[PDB]
Amino acid sequence: SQDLSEALKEATKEVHIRAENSEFMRNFQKGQVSREGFKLVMASLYHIYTALEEEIERNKQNPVYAPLYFPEELHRRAALEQDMAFWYGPHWQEAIPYTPATQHYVKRLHEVGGTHPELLVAHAYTRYLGDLSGGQVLKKIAQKAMALPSSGEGLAFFTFPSIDNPTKFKQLYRARMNTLEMTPEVKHRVTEEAKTAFLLNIELFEELQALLTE
Incomplete structure (x- = not known):
């Protein structure tokens, strides 16, 4: 559609349906989240958000991304560091895994922010707007499925202290987007990269499930 927010939504209709019907998320949905499986995804997400936000800060002052710059609200490297401490322990940095699918994801994020920063909007959109929509239910499920503390340790990733009204913030993010x-040519390339970003997540979920069965 005309609006980029409306355009990305219609372009990422199919891949999103695949994402939430992929093996691993499919169980996750219905209270079926193994702790070893949960440890695996969060460790993989650590590397992604570390890389992603590293390239966001690099291009924080660039008119192709600047309107989507929310370091207090959305940046999640902080939260993930706190979770890896909880799940993996004191010496988590060395304990944590770095799967091929995660490397493939990280590689593309660095490629984009480095040489194609105009497409960085695609990757932030795929991750952040997902954490504020799809992720908010999964925090409820994970906490009960694994019996976590009432404080919220281990689910710091899903906690957004600088967001009081994520339903309102989602509208604000779309408006800034x-x-x-x-140009319409670049716009198409963004929505095309958005599909690539989803694919990187689908292939991530499909990999970790395979690793969990082994």
């Missing part, structure tokens, strides 16, 4: 001055 539509502000981005770009």
Whole structure:
């Protein structure tokens, strides 16, 4: 559609349906989240958000991304560091795994922020708007499925202290996204990269499930 927010939504209709019907998320949905499986995804997500936000900060002052710059609200490297401490222990940095699918994801994020920063909007959109929508239910499920503390340790990733009204913030993010001055050619490339970003997540979920069965 005209609006970029409306355009990305219609382009990522199919891949999103695949994402939430992929083996691992499919169980996760219905209270079926193994702790070893949960340890695996969060460790993989650590590497992604570390890389992603590293490239966001690099291009924080660039008109192709600047309107979507929310370090207090959305940046999640902090939260994931706290979770890896909880799940993996004191010496978590060395204990944590770095799967091929995660490397493939990280590699693309660095490629994008480095040489194609105009497409960085695609990757933030795929991750952050997912954490504020799809992720908010999965925090409820995970906490009960694994019997975590009432404080919220281990699920710091899903906790957004600088967001009081994520339903309102999601609208604000979309509005800021539509502000981005770009040609229809680049716009198409963004929505195309959005599908690539989803694919990287689907292939991640499908890999970790395979690793969990072994």
